[PDB]
Design an enzyme around this catalytic site. Structure first.
Site, short mmCIF file in Angstrom:
data_model
loop_
_atom_site.label_atom_id
_atom_site.label_comp_id
_atom_site.label_asym_id
_atom_site.label_seq_id
_atom_site.Cartn_x
_atom_site.Cartn_y
_atom_site.Cartn_z
N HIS A 76 18.75 -0.09 31.05
CA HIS A 76 19.29 -1.41 31.36
C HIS A 76 20.78 -1.56 31.09
O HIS A 76 21.30 -2.66 31.21
CB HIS A 76 18.57 -2.51 30.55
CG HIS A 76 17.10 -2.57 30.78
ND1 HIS A 76 16.52 -3.52 31.59
CD2 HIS A 76 16.08 -1.80 30.31
CE1 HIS A 76 15.21 -3.35 31.59
NE2 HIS A 76 14.92 -2.31 30.83
N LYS B 261 31.09 -9.88 30.57
CA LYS B 261 30.73 -10.98 31.48
C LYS B 261 31.89 -11.90 31.87
O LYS B 261 31.76 -12.74 32.79
CB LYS B 261 29.57 -11.78 30.87
CG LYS B 261 28.26 -10.99 30.79
CD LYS B 261 27.22 -11.68 29.91
CE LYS B 261 25.93 -10.88 29.72
NZ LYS B 261 25.05 -10.81 30.93
N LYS C 280 18.28 -16.28 40.18
CA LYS C 280 17.74 -17.62 39.93
C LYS C 280 18.54 -18.67 40.66
O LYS C 280 17.96 -19.59 41.24
CB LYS C 280 17.77 -17.96 38.43
CG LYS C 280 16.86 -17.06 37.61
CD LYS C 280 17.13 -17.24 36.12
CE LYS C 280 16.59 -16.07 35.33
NZ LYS C 280 16.92 -16.19 33.93
N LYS D 226 24.85 -17.59 30.56
CA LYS D 226 24.48 -16.21 30.22
C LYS D 226 25.01 -15.98 28.80
O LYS D 226 25.86 -16.73 28.31
CB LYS D 226 25.09 -15.19 31.18
CG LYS D 226 26.61 -15.29 31.32
CD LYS D 226 27.19 -14.48 32.48
CE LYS D 226 26.72 -14.96 33.86
NZ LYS D 226 25.87 -13.96 34.59
N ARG D 227 24.55 -14.91 28.16
CA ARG D 227 25.06 -14.58 26.82
C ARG D 227 26.59 -14.40 26.86
O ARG D 227 27.12 -13.93 27.86
CB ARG D 227 24.35 -13.33 26.28
CG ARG D 227 22.89 -13.58 25.88
CD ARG D 227 22.78 -14.52 24.68
NE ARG D 227 23.37 -13.91 23.49
CZ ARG D 227 22.71 -13.22 22.55
NH1 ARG D 227 21.38 -13.04 22.62
NH2 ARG D 227 23.38 -12.72 21.51
N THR E 88 19.99 -11.08 36.36
CA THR E 88 18.87 -11.83 36.92
C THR E 88 19.15 -13.33 37.09
O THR E 88 18.54 -13.98 37.94
CB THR E 88 17.59 -11.64 36.08
OG1 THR E 88 17.88 -11.92 34.71
CG2 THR E 88 17.07 -10.24 36.22
O1 LIG Z 1 19.85 -4.65 16.40
C1 LIG Z 1 19.91 -3.65 17.15
O2 LIG Z 1 20.13 -2.49 16.74
C2 LIG Z 1 19.84 -3.88 18.64
C3 LIG Z 1 19.54 -5.12 19.18
C4 LIG Z 1 19.52 -5.32 20.55
C5 LIG Z 1 19.78 -4.26 21.44
C6 LIG Z 1 19.84 -4.46 22.92
C7 LIG Z 1 19.35 -5.60 23.57
C8 LIG Z 1 19.49 -5.77 24.94
C9 LIG Z 1 20.16 -4.81 25.71
C10 LIG Z 1 20.35 -4.90 27.16
N1 LIG Z 1 20.79 -3.92 27.91
N2 LIG Z 1 20.85 -4.39 29.21
C11 LIG Z 1 20.44 -5.64 29.22
C12 LIG Z 1 20.34 -6.50 30.44
O3 LIG Z 1 19.08 -6.23 31.07
C13 LIG Z 1 18.82 -7.05 32.23
C14 LIG Z 1 17.45 -6.69 32.74
O4 LIG Z 1 17.43 -5.38 33.32
C15 LIG Z 1 19.92 -6.83 33.28
O5 LIG Z 1 19.71 -7.72 34.37
C16 LIG Z 1 21.31 -7.05 32.69
O6 LIG Z 1 22.31 -6.67 33.65
C17 LIG Z 1 21.49 -6.23 31.41
O7 LIG Z 1 22.73 -6.55 30.78
N3 LIG Z 1 20.11 -5.98 27.94
C18 LIG Z 1 20.68 -3.70 25.06
C19 LIG Z 1 20.55 -3.55 23.70
C20 LIG Z 1 20.09 -3.02 20.87
C21 LIG Z 1 20.12 -2.83 19.51
C1 LIG Z 2 17.88 -15.28 33.38
C2 LIG Z 2 18.30 -15.56 31.96
C3 LIG Z 2 19.31 -14.70 31.31
C4 LIG Z 2 19.97 -13.55 32.06
O1 LIG Z 2 21.10 -14.09 32.76
P1 LIG Z 2 22.27 -13.09 33.28
O2 LIG Z 2 23.20 -14.01 34.01
O3 LIG Z 2 21.54 -12.15 34.22
O4 LIG Z 2 22.80 -12.49 32.02
C5 LIG Z 2 19.71 -14.97 30.02
N1 LIG Z 2 19.19 -15.99 29.32
C6 LIG Z 2 18.28 -16.84 29.79
C7 LIG Z 2 17.77 -17.95 28.93
C8 LIG Z 2 17.76 -16.68 31.16
O5 LIG Z 2 16.82 -17.51 31.66
#
Ligand SMILES: O=C(O)c1ccc(-c2ccc(-c3nnc([C@@H]4O[C@H](CO)[C@@H](O)[C@H](O)[C@H]4O)[nH]3)cc2)cc1
Ligand SMILES: *Cc1c(COP(=O)(O)O)cnc(C)c1O
Ligand SMILES: O=C(O)c1ccc(-c2ccc(-c3nnc([C@@H]4O[C@H](CO)[C@@H](O)[C@H](O)[C@H]4O)[nH]3)cc2)cc1
Ligand SMILES: O=c1[nH]cnc2c1ncn2[C@@H]1O[C@H](COP(=O)(O)O)[C@@H](O)[C@H]1O
Ligand SMILES: O=c1[nH]cnc2c1ncn2[C@@H]1O[C@H](COP(=O)(O)O)[C@@H](O)[C@H]1O
Ligand SMILES: *Cc1c(COP(=O)(O)O)cnc(C)c1O
Lengths: 810, 810
Positions: free
Chosen positions: A351, A548, A654, A542-543, A650
């Site tokens: 991801h 971003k 939406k 978004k976060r 995603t």
């Molecule tokens: O505390 C920790 O060590 C730790 C905590 C959290 C994470 C962590 C959490 C989330 C993600 C992460 N990587 N891609 C994502 C998101 O996944 C979505 C679904 O496929 C995509 O639409 C987004 O484009 C992408 O940014 N999330 C990557 C790492 C990793 C480590």
């Molecule tokens: C869909 C959704 C996301 C992901 O949004 P991106 O614009 O793809 O980062 C994050 N948080 C919430 C609460 C959502 O519903």
């Protein structure tokens, strides 16, 4: 009231009313004279839950009898949101419940607002898992979601003095009516200890035991009577734990801390020991459950024909050496047979390509916590590198690059490398991302095993993200093309025939306007903020992360402000600019960006010369239930990540489904969205991936943009000199310093194109009929982005199972 | 099956069966093919709970409308045991449920055994609170039990190698169907901080907040449709608590530790800070609830007419300064008015004269934790001592003795002194104890305020302790005198007319013999131990403590063993000697006594010459549910505390009601039991209180008894030389040393009389007809020891309310 919400027959309404009253009396132990709205919510939730359970029991029975291949979706995150309305929609009970509650003198929408979000995720990855569970049930797959029941989910965000403050999300305080504790199926998980080698193989001894207690939540499919299970593990101390007396009892908290709290990092690897324990805990408990269910139908040759394990990123990557451990140490299979079974069972979804997000665990941690797993990892690595050496003889650098073991000051295990070696399929989450994986970070692996690498473009469930959150739009679509599109979203293509239909154009625009009035009212009531509902609603939710580029949006907002101050008496298209999202508590720059956004608002929103032509609003506590309100109200969707950094997105999908136009870069799924709708129906700007590469080769010098763009220079001077922070003149110096000297995401490089593209947006918004026709072209081509499509592709191309739309008996 | 268990009508049985099946399906989410006995227990418990709730809601409504005076029973302990059977008995559902479950192919007794004891108490004091709640509901009083919902109750005891091991009593693991969480009525409790004095009085500021969340449990009266409430507080952290981020969430455990675990001390003051926090937590939350309910009917002159607060020992003594704090600091009453209200509202029950059991809190602890309360305590003390000085001018020593503040190395607050000063009534728990209070430890207080001092002799509920645990005895009594005795136990006196009735003698003896066979079978199944059911069952079950003199029983047991070895071929009446009970984890000597008992058993039970003439069994994990099994099987009840030390006892009364004869000292309620039955129908021995005093004046010299009693000398030599511990010869040297040099309870002084009295017991047991006639005389005169009698006396003489046997509508 509206057709997509089902029937409200006399007998159904009558029976719901009596069961509502039964639960109020017997379950909640309240009479009607002292019941609060919260009591009424719970009485309804229990009433609706009763309709699930017959179907839930029958579905699980059906799977035990037919014995289909089982799909196990392992994730550290499931961002579920609220359950009440989704359940009513999927069981066709929404109008009946509305009517039944109305007759009892209650407003069902008011009761829906009382439910807590299950916020067991950070953002996109966790929410994808939730959409996938919905689509798996809707497609009749024998699928189980496995995760952790965090006592505290993603923190609630408060803004105090324009700064983010975190508070604990105590989501279980009033109880969770949707879950069922299953303490009877509690399983042991081991930590620490050491390895003994006997004549009868290896043995992991002297371990500390934590118990894993499962909680099951029902996952209903769309009108097919299928109800699947989400099983979430909770940590419990054993009863002999530490057994002066009082302190031993209090120290039980140390074991139970494993399931206490979600780590609130999005796209950032922090790597705490407690987090590693969470990862192993979910893996160890889940695999025992999987094997138990497989044995109740020892020949593990058929294991991959009856089991698929999908790894949601590397977070459950320990499933690979754990499966090996169980098969070799406990079941006494030879290594090669066990490895064959493991590879055919496991599949890995990546991801992200951001280096700081990739999990690389220090060897010393693994050695202490999971010494047997580390031995198995070394063995996997040595056998894997033996294959690389035979395929590419003499290529010693390739051996170093592909190793599972990373050298350096501290030795680490690269978990992505482990997942690739131990999976029969590796996929990215959008075409551009999947290509980037093959050309950049996993290039070596692709050259060794090209057959592993796939794409599965992400999607969203049209149940939650259209029918549930935007009933008015769902209805006017249903009036023209019927209801079948709700489980077959490609049917939205039929709407292209109505692009010149004056009644349909009027109805689409009216639905949007109603959504905007309803959201503008929501803002006034809950947050004391007043916005112009005739303005263009410009939304970025978004976060908060540097990639971003919320900061690029900030630069445009200040540009519009400065242009208004320069020429006060010129017409501009009014905008409400809304930015929302949480920053990870440790991510200083993300917290500074939030403060900048609220500081811009403090100047813009109180300037009398601006009037209601421009408002900047920071949407507090962005979460799934707030997304359901704001996305249907949006005109413009901001998807402005630096090309190459957002794997898919995603949120983008939406907004497309709900009648907003998109301004964005050619990044992630934006590329495929523009391809489906036509580029002429998208506001595309900025560097492509290839342009970013060329700029990196030459060297990014932000000063050049500062020197050549007077409007950009003015903004940087305002930030530095304290225009947006008069009492603390240097408050934003870290933001300025980063932009000028250390900007990894090239905010200035896209500034000019972004501003020009934003001018084209405003020009179109002045012609409502053509804006609305462009909207219809977006909604009509959004069908590809159904998670039903995504899941059907995982099913056929990875898991080897056939989806089905057939109904089980009711 | 038997008449005292109610009717099993067709419609009732039918309706229970359908609701059982409804709960199995909808509540437990199980089909019948995978349900375990535990699932069936829960389906029944929920079915029976439904019958409570209509009555519970109606009762609380009735109290809100009529507004009677409310009784608040505050205790740190409620030793409730199991609830299922008690609820069925009190609602007359037992035969209907038996029949309904039988028709579904289930044995209800098997399902009853699955329920966990609610073990939220140590022993007698906690169990008294439970019996009192039952009697208050049965007498139609508007009464509320208030306490703490401990997550872990009294520890489960395992015996390993003859030693006690403790493990956590995880009683909530599978859920508690009887309670209802009321998170809506959560209240703040304050700790630490400091006091500011303004012109508007004192203010307690800078405090730490812990939330108190109530859980309500129904308390049904005997067949009167009254259901009262037991409200137990659970500790919760506030959501802004400590709010890096992750650690702040994990540190919520520190606040929640307040309600984690019961301190397992019986008659011993340990005085940890966490314990002080428990005491204040229950007091603070309860008083807010009391005042809220009083306001919902500000003139506090009527407060004592609408509220009584009964303090179960000094454990909730902080109620006194807390009530003062609320009335003075928050409601702005003047001191004198507030004090008047407090004294008329509060009453104190003392349960012990042992110096080590009396709560004396260090001033520094109170100063840090509750600085405002300490100020109020000093003020109370100074005004109180001003009254003593005016009544007894010049008597400076009296001033020092009566002070609430105790001088020394560390200054302490004497909580008993606080309770006496701030209560309108102080009572002991048996006539002899109440007299001891007036003559010894509270003599000075009695001279100042003689009108405060009362007696309320303890009792037990005949619902749990006859009808529930001994249905066979209840039935044969009911055959002769009807059912009215169950709520009017004085009616047992009518049984004196059957003392020469041959059929009744036969039936009493047959019931006992059935109880003994059933208990002997229970022992074989659950514990792999084989006992002769024709032997005399000689039972001592109670907490292990030096004052209770389990060691004197041990000396008699070894005496019988040595006599058998001396004259192997002489007839002796066979005995099974059963001793059971828990030792506090920190109480080394109590743990050594347990080890001695199991060591004696190891020698006695495997000597071939003894045969089945003598067995010594240590009953493991003694608790309320084990008491319900062993007490009906007992022939001889051992109540052998040193005269002056057992305030009352209640186990003594349980055995009397169930057809055992008593061997005991003239201590506590034993005195009144002998008075009711006739001394000729009791096996009384040993020093009276006056004899103990005379021996203390002269000096207790244990050596004198050793030198004059050859049989006692032999036992001490066996203990010292390692006869009962061959691999560890000196294992019992601390026991020997204590007996010879430091015995506060004068075990040797009662040895000779005890052994001789035990010979008279054996002689009577040889004549079954006369044994059984003596039994009938005990059962027939046990009516005084109903807790219904006790509670009626508290009601009329302390609380100023009239009990009632009238039924509310069903
Ligand atoms: O505390 C920790 O060590 C730790 C905590 C959290 C994470 C962590 C959490 C989330 C993600 C992460 N990587 N891609 C994502 C998101 O996944 C979505 C679904 O496929 C995509 O639409 C987004 O484009 C992408 O940014 N999330 C990557 C790492 C990793 C480590
Ligand atoms: C869909 C959704 C996301 C992901 O949004 P991106 O614009 O793809 O980062 C994050 N948080 C919430 C609460 C959502 O519903
Ligand atoms: O941890 C602490 O500090 C702590 C813990 C527990 C206690 C504590 C607990 C219980 C008792 C206590 N005192 N008398 C009792 C018992 O109360 C019964 C009911 O009236 C009587 O029948 C018994 O004769 C008497 O021994 N229990 C006394 C103190 C005190 C302090
Ligand atoms: O031995 C069995 N007999 C009958 N049904 C079973 C048995 N084992 C499992 N099932 C069914 O399949 C489900 C098992 O859930 P699981 O054990 O979590 O997969 C149950 O709800 C039953 O309906
Ligand atoms: O304002 C009121 N209206 C009607 N009934 C009430 C009200 N307040 C309390 N009651 C009744 O008394 C009970 C109050 O419980 P309590 O607040 O715990 O004493 C409720 O269950 C109601 O039946
Ligand atoms: C009645 C009872 C007690 C009190 O017994 P005493 O002999 O009065 O100390 C202690 N524990 C349990 C479990 C009881 O039922």
């Amino acid at each position: 009231q509206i057709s997509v919400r089902g029937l409200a027959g006399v007998e159904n309404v009558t029976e719901l009313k009596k069961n509502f009253n039964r639960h109020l009396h017997f379950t909640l132990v309240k009479d009607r004279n002292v019941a609060t709205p919260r009591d009424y919510y719970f009485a309804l939730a229990h009433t609706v839950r009763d309709h699930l359970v017959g179907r839930w029991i029958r579905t699980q029975q059906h799977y035990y009898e037919k014995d289909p291949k089982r799909i196990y979706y392992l994730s550290l995150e499931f961002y579920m949101g609220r359950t009440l309305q989704n359940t009513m929609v999927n069981l066709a009970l929404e109008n009946a419940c509305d009517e039944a509650t109305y007759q009892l003198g209650l407003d069902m929408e008011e009761l829906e607002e009382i439910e807590e979000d299950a916020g067991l995720g950070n953002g996109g990855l966790g929410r994808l898992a939730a959409c996938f569970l919905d689509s798996m049930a809707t497609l009749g797959l024998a699928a189980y979601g496995y995760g952790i029941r965090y006592e505290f989910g993603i923190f609630n965000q408060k803004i105090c003095g324009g700064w983010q403050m975190e508070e604990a999300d105590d989501w279980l305080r009033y109880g969770n009516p949707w879950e069922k504790a299953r303490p009877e199926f509690t399983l042991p998980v081991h930590f620490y200890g050491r390895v003994e080698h006997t004549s009868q193989g290896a043995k992991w001894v002297d371990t500390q035991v934590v118990l894993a207690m499962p909680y099951d939540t029902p996952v209903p499919g769309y009108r097919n009577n299928v109800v699947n299970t989400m099983r979430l593990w909770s940590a419990k101390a054993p009863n002999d734990f530490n057994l002066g007396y009082i302190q031993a009892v209090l120290d039980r908290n140390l074991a139970e801390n494993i399931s206490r709290v979600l780590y609130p990092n999005d796209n950032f690897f922090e790597g705490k020991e407690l987090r590693l324990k969470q990862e192993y805990f979910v893996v160890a408990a889940t695999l025992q459950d999987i094997i138990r269910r497989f044995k109740s139908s020892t020949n593990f040759d058929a294991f991959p024909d009856k089991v698929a394990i999908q790894l949601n990123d590397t977070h459950p990557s320990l499933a690979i050496p754990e499966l090996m451990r169980v098969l070799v140490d406990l079941e006494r299979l030879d290594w090669d047979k066990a490895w064959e079974v493991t590879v055919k069972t496991c599949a890995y979804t990546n991801h992200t390509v951001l280096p700081e997000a990739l999990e690389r665990w220090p060897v010393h941690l693994l050695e202490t916590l999971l010494p047997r797993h580390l031995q198995i990892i070394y063995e996997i690595n040595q056998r894997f590198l033996n294959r690389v050496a035979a395929a590419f003889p003499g290529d010693v650098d390739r051996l170093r690059r592909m190793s599972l073991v990373e050298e350096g000051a501290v030795k680490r295990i690269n978990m992505a490398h482990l997942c690739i070696a131990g999976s029969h399929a590796v996929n990215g989450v959008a075409r551009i991302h999947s290509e980037i994986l093959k050309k950049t970070i996993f290039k070596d692996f692709y050259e060794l095993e090209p057959h592993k690498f796939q794409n599965k473009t992400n999607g969203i469930t049209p149940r939650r993200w259209l029918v549930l959150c935007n009933p008015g739009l769902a209805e006017i679509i249903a009036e023209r093309i019927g209801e079948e599109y709700i489980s077959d979203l490609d049917q939205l293509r039929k709407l292209l025939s109505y692009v010149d239909d004056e009644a349909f154009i009027r109805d689409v625009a009216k639905v949007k306007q109603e959504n905007k009035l309803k959201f503008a009212a929501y803002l006034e009531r809950e947050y004391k903020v007043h916005i112009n509902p005739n303005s263009l609603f410009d939304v970025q939710v978004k976060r908060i992360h540097e990639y971003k580029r919320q900061l690029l949006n900030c630069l445009h907002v200040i540009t519009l402000y400065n242009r208004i101050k320069k020429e006060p008496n010129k017409f501009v298209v009014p905008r409400t600019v809304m930015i929302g999202g949480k920053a990870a508590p440790g991510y200083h720059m993300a917290k500074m960006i939030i403060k900048l956004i609220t500081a811009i608002g403090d100047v813009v929103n109180h300037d009398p010369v601006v009037g209601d032509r421009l408002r900047v609003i920071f949407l507090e506590n962005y979460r799934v239930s707030l997304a359901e309100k704001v996305i249907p109200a949006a005109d413009l969707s901001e998807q402005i990540s630096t090309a190459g950094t957002e794997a898919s997105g995603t949120g983008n999908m939406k907004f497309m489904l709900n009648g907003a136009l998109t301004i964005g870069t050619m990044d992630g799924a934006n590329v495929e969205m523009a391809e489906e709708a036509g580029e002429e129906n998208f506001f595309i700007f900025g560097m492509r991936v290839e342009d970013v590469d060329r700029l990196d080769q030459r060297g990014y010098n932000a000063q050049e943009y500062y020197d050549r763009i007077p409007e950009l220079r003015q903004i940087i001077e305002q930030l530095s000199s304290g225009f947006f922070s008069p009492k603390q003149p240097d408050l934003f110096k870290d933001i300025v310093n980063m932009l000028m000297h250390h900007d990894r995401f090239k905010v200035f490089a896209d500034y000019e194109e972004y501003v020009k593209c934003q001018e084209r947006v405003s020009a179109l918004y002045k012609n409502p009929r053509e804006w609305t026709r462009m909207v219809i072209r977006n909604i009509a081509t959004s069908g590809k982005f159904s998670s039903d499509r995504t899941i059907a592709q995982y099913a056929r191309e990875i898991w080897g199972v056939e989806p089905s739309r057939q109904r089980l008996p009711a």
